[PDB]
Design an enzyme around this catalytic site. Structure first.
Site, short mmCIF file in Angstrom:
data_model
loop_
_atom_site.label_atom_id
_atom_site.label_comp_id
_atom_site.label_asym_id
_atom_site.label_seq_id
_atom_site.Cartn_x
_atom_site.Cartn_y
_atom_site.Cartn_z
N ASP A 174 -11.51 -11.92 10.52
CA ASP A 174 -10.49 -12.20 9.53
C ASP A 174 -9.18 -12.56 10.21
OD1 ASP A 174 -9.39 -12.04 6.87
OD2 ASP A 174 -8.88 -9.94 7.21
N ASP A 192 -5.01 -13.77 -3.37
CA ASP A 192 -4.48 -13.58 -2.02
C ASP A 192 -4.67 -14.88 -1.25
OD1 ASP A 192 -3.74 -10.90 -2.43
OD2 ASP A 192 -5.08 -10.11 -0.89
N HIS A 221 0.86 -1.18 0.00
CA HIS A 221 0.00 0.00 0.00
C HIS A 221 0.90 1.23 0.00
CE1 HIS A 221 -2.35 -3.02 2.22
NE2 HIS A 221 -3.42 -2.41 1.76
N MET A 245 2.38 -6.05 -7.79
CA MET A 245 1.08 -5.51 -7.47
C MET A 245 1.28 -4.39 -6.45
SD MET A 245 -1.29 -5.54 -4.75
CE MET A 245 -1.39 -7.10 -3.82
N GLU A 262 -10.84 -6.63 -4.67
CA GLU A 262 -10.74 -7.64 -3.63
C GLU A 262 -12.00 -7.62 -2.80
OE1 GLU A 262 -7.10 -7.59 -1.59
OE2 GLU A 262 -7.95 -8.57 0.22
N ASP A 269 2.34 1.99 3.32
CA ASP A 269 3.34 1.07 3.84
C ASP A 269 4.74 1.50 3.46
OD1 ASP A 269 1.29 -0.71 4.71
OD2 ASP A 269 1.39 -1.81 2.81
N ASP A 276 -6.30 -14.15 8.83
CA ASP A 276 -5.05 -13.99 8.08
C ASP A 276 -3.97 -14.97 8.56
OD1 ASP A 276 -6.26 -12.07 6.49
OD2 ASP A 276 -5.15 -10.38 7.29
N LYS A 280 -14.66 -8.60 0.25
CA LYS A 280 -14.65 -9.08 1.63
C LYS A 280 -16.05 -8.87 2.18
CE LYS A 280 -12.05 -8.73 5.98
NZ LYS A 280 -11.04 -7.96 6.75
N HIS A 327 -11.42 -14.40 3.04
CA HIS A 327 -12.59 -13.54 2.86
C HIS A 327 -13.80 -14.33 2.42
CE1 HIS A 327 -10.00 -9.65 2.48
NE2 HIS A 327 -9.83 -10.30 3.62
N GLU A 360 -9.51 -13.44 -1.89
CA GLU A 360 -8.70 -13.84 -0.74
C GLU A 360 -9.35 -15.04 -0.07
OE1 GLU A 360 -7.52 -12.07 3.60
OE2 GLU A 360 -6.77 -10.98 1.84
N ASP A 381 -1.44 -12.70 1.73
CA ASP A 381 -1.94 -11.62 2.57
C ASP A 381 -2.25 -12.28 3.92
OD1 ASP A 381 -2.96 -9.44 3.75
OD2 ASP A 381 -4.75 -9.30 2.51
MG MG Z 1 -6.14 -9.30 1.03
MG MG Z 2 -7.92 -10.93 5.29
#
Ligand code: MG
Ligand code: MG
Ligand code: MG
Ligand code: MG
Ligand code: MG
Ligand code: MG
Ligand code: MG
Ligand code: MG
Lengths: 386, 386, 386, 386
Positions: B254, B244, B53, B87, B180, B56, B256, B182, B219, B216, B286
């Site tokens: 979520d 993802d 991002h 990406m 993406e 980031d 992850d 979610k 998600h 993802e 991710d």
């Molecule tokens: Mg993601």
């Molecule tokens: Mg996630």
């Protein structure tokens, strides 16, 4: 006192009030209902019409004379009561032949039989006045990862729907199709599991204008999704051809509670959306009176579906009409949401220093949205506590 | 011994290995990680590249000078290692200004700022070589029904994506967009909640060829959906631009988790599908190393993501190459599912007595699918117990 | 107009209205609130009292003079307003030291520190008037199967609670403990995940009379469970020492919506049960005003919690008072459910031919339960449509 | 090659391999199976025994003569094979008379009949050698809030179980009871919905030593709970009298997949726990071969249940025996979790400066848990990729 009348366009499937109460852990608790009786009783409750699967009206395997007599009796009841048939559908899930699907069965002979069974019932639906032909592919899917190649299955599903569109076009029928998504049950996972997946699939059909969705409250809620949001996307796409109303308590087996039960607040926002958007289709109830009930409870449950819709319609109308709500909507900038972001166009946006170099992020971030006061006005209206 | 190589195209977000461990009930447990260190350590582990991002890489609010220095240091590390940046994406969720959304914030000024922030980072993404620009609308949605008119919000979302497509076209950039989905978190319900909803939305964009999905694992599983099935529909539509990978234990927040954790069987079928279909895009993770871990655990978790992918690739390839599995696939008629249902055409189908009057329903119903033996062969292969 | 007053016993945690809006994807949207201001504002809204974690009142790591000044200021606000402190709790989840738990951390030194931190705050809670000391073990659990031996962890949890019971007994305090279950979040799975698991654990403590539950609406709903049913079992066991009220939309992250939001019908049945049973404890709100809100929205959201309780209390009272409802309850045999099955005793039951050899199963099976009409009366009362 | 042997104590219900395939949307796909054939075929597969509901063995409504003949034929098959019957249960859910429950039906006459039907089958269970009598109250619960006063229902449930305990004590039978929790389905919510709720209820029975739990993998997973954690609490309480093994894909209808399907990692940790703890009871499969299958698939699915248990047993044993895993367990302080927190006693803890004033919070917080490396070792062992 919230009495339904035919103007309200409330409809019921024969299989709803006619559900005998068999579940996978239990035998039937009610005797079979004659469709003629269901038509008469629903008319007395103020319904606008009824719907059917082929197999609800004509026992599977009937001869032509049996088929004709069953249809004749049903038609006579429609003519006697004035009840309409706005939608019909095919049973491609009960009989063991469909245990791996209809249109996406791995066996090609079953796929072709499923299409022929559907086409026969399209003709009957058109005869009886249906404007929408629903397809709920309850057996399309799998319990295990190797059992179904989903890319191949989607090819087969597209082929089937394309052929059905060719059929209705060739016959000059005005009927349109509505795909009913469901995420699971009776298959471990069902193909086209939500409104979104069905809408996406439709865009790849040869004649996409002939197909929309028939979303069901409980089905989207079985994936934990926001049913009003899904309906909004269907309306945005011009694809809300029909709707199935019931109740569901979140993520579990498909409960088919009467409408208003389950997620009551979601029912409120759903009715608000349908009425605000001017949805003009049937308000169809795909529900099951619980197997605890006798027939008096069947009719009470059906009456409750309609009653709850009408109470919620009154409360949502009062909410939108309230000057204090109109003020709260402005305070929350719902009016700004309806304005184009950049009707000045890309180049003007890129050249607008107020959109970036001079944008006061901290001042914008300090603005409250006032959503809690708006929602408490909505609660007050729903509960009649204003 | 399942060692990753850069040709495997494994990629990681800076925010993954760099997650400091703040959760909604807990403060950070790890100090901040320099992106330069992440590039070097991920390269040592066999990764192909990293993603970012805007915020980031460049602290929010940095001067042009500070921004140039941050990018320069990062580029030097990429140049020294040969690591790629396939990406990039925009942070339109952390800063309080985005608390009601970026592209679908009720406040119009915020929507314009979100677009400008995105466009600036598209330019940076192109400079760094990104082939895909991801959009995860984590703040697009609502906690209450009155806060967000979803039809208007979809209008604003389409407007935003259309303007971004006009921008990339006007600049001659080859980059494409990946939405993406979610279903929820951090908003109570998020707009475009699943792969299906995003695919459906894309078809209504002005230049749909510029947009695909970035699904993802976790998600879709937060809605209880079958991730391999959703990926299959994305592939069928030609829209799997990026993916993802992570793990999730069903329907909850979520998580992850590292890839392979959560639903292990779903991970197997996912890898089988990506490899069988010839997916050629990044295998992007991710994920978040749990906040229980120190930095040795961070790098172990990242290595585990790639290791589990490679183990599953081996087992899925062994499954597909096993003549006993191929025999089981034929016994279950997976090959037959690939035959067109009615390439003979509608009229021939309607005239085919073998598809209706002479179809032996009870003989067809008696045929077992043999899916359990097939699935146990898949289990045996997954576990290396053949 | 549903105005709360202190007689209603509504209480709020400092961390509720004081939540600054940080979520795992977003920075704070509101500045920190002084506890003194929260006490004053909540009193103005009609609250009965406030609750606190140690760390909400006294910043972690404070010196004794800082601790004394913070407590002094808070006490002065309590004295000024008349607000009570009926419950307090320990923060054993935010600080990184607790990342693997407090009482069930794998490290023994952390377990002992967690106990010492709790005991210090028990003394403060008793000083300020708390009758209940809550324990929410939000970090007790695991993300992976090998990380926590649950049998050993339960031994450690029992040891901790037994020591706390020895402490309060040795000091002669009247305070009692209330364990707050939660199924997950922030850990992948939390120990004692539901009301049932907590009730079962309590029965194995050395002094079980000193411990009850503090169930939270949203927590049981995160496991898809029926919150009124769980409260009924807690009341049946004599263990409902305290309760946390909020809203939740089914199975997803812990939303902490204002009470009445989420599952509105469940909120109705909850209030009906608490009022019918004569629950006399605090009606405590553990909720978070959404981060979209400014401070006016914070106070509106807190006011809405209380308002919704009071509306539901009126509707449930009207439901139970309605002669038509009393008749429907009889029609559904709720009165028969309260009669002993076999107060005649085992031998008489075994000798009663009407219970078996002469029992007319088909006549019994034909009786409808009339539950749908009863539920529609409940709906009518909830919506004020009688 | 993972071949089961009778000493493994694998058992199956007659209703598992004998499920004819009716689901709520589909008719039976397989003809009825003679219990004698099931006994013989399960023996050939390496099973230890079978279990039954009364109505699986003796058609409901059979005369005493017919009942004797059905039991005689079954006993002859057991005698010819050496197969055992370690558990039996009552069908208090299929017949319409039980539509509102057995022991907690609102109608008192039904509650008495349910007890008599149960007692008759306890006698038969004892004749056949069952050590455990299971009770799954699938109809105990409600679809609507007013239908069932849960406090009264728990009173009736306790009364029933107390009478059954009096019966077995009066007769001198060694058999014990095991309550099988389930959260929902077929009722909207079922009473005693999880292991925790059942354990808590048992502690309030008159003779608690006679009652334990029979947890089912899929049932706890229908609430999103961690099945190994729940089993750990049952073992900690001394209450794991029996267990039901199957697979489930998270939160949806009860799938009853073969063991090892659904959540494979949870199956691994379950087998690890049962074997490590020395559980000595039956490994019973309550599963349903999918209705897609013929009888060859039925027996393949049953064989797969046992095969997957044995593969997982091997991998869990290899994990525990690996010195590298043992080192990882020590690095993560799993051994330290077994040390008492404060066997020195309360006063010593209160006087221990190392537990508070001199506890180095930041040094403790800096310690990583090393849980990710441990979990990847577990993954490697599960997949045979070490
Ligand atoms: Mg993601
Ligand atoms: Mg996630
Ligand atoms: Mg349904
Ligand atoms: Mg439907
Ligand atoms: Mg909470
Ligand atoms: Mg709480
Ligand atoms: Mg089950
Ligand atoms: Mg079972």
């Amino acid at each position: 006192n919230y009495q339904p009348t035919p103007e309200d366009r409330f409809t019921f499937g024969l299989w709803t009030v006619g559900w005998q109460g068999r579940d996978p852990f239990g035998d039937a608790t009610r005797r079979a209902l004659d469709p003629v009786e269901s038509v008469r009783r629903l008319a007395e409750l103020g319904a606008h019409g009824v719907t059917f699967h082929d197999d609800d009206l004509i026992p599977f395997g009937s001869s032509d004379s049996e088929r004709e007599e069953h249809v004749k009796r049903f038609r006579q009841a429609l003519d006697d009561t004035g009840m309409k048939v706005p939608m019909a559908t095919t049973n491609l899930f009960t009989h063991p032949v469909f245990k791996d699907g209809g249109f996406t069965a791995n066996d090609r002979d079953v796929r072709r039989y499923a299409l022929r069974k559907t086409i026969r019932n399209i003709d009957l639906a058109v005869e009886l006045g249906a404007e929408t032909y629903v397809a709920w592919g309850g057996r399309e899917g799998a319990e295990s990862g190797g059992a179904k190649d989903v890319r191949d299955a989607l090819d087969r599903m597209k082929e089937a729907f394309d052929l059905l569109g060719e059929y209705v076009t060739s016959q000059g029928y005005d009927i349109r199709f509505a795909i009913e998504p469901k995420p699971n049950e009776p298959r471990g996972d069902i193909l086209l599991p939500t409104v979104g997946h069905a809408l996406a699939f439709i865009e790849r059909l040869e004649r996409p204008e002939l197909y929309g969705v028939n979303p069901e409250v409980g089905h989207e809620q079985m994936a934990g999704l926001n049913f009003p949001h899904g309906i909004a996307q269907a309306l945005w796409a011009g694809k809300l051809f029909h709707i199935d109303l019931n109740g569901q308590n979140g993520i579990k087996y498909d409960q088919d509670l009467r409408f208003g039960a389950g997620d009551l607040r979601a029912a409120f926002w759903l009715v608000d959306l349908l009425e605000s958007a001017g949805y003009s289709g049937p308000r169809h109830f795909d529900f099951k009176p619980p197997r605890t009930e006798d027939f008096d409870g069947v009719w009470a449950s059906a009456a409750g579906c309609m009653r709850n819709y009408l109470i919620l319609k009154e409360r949502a109308a009062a909410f939108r009409a309230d000057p204090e709500v109109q003020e709260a909507l402005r305070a929350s900038r719902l009016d700004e949401l309806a304005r184009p972001t950049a009707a000045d166009g890309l180049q003007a946006l890129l050249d607008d220093r107020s959109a970036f170099e001079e944008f006061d992020v901290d001042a914008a971030a300090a603005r409250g949205m006032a959503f809690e006061r708006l929602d408490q006005l909505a609660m007050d209206h729903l509960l009649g506590a204003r």
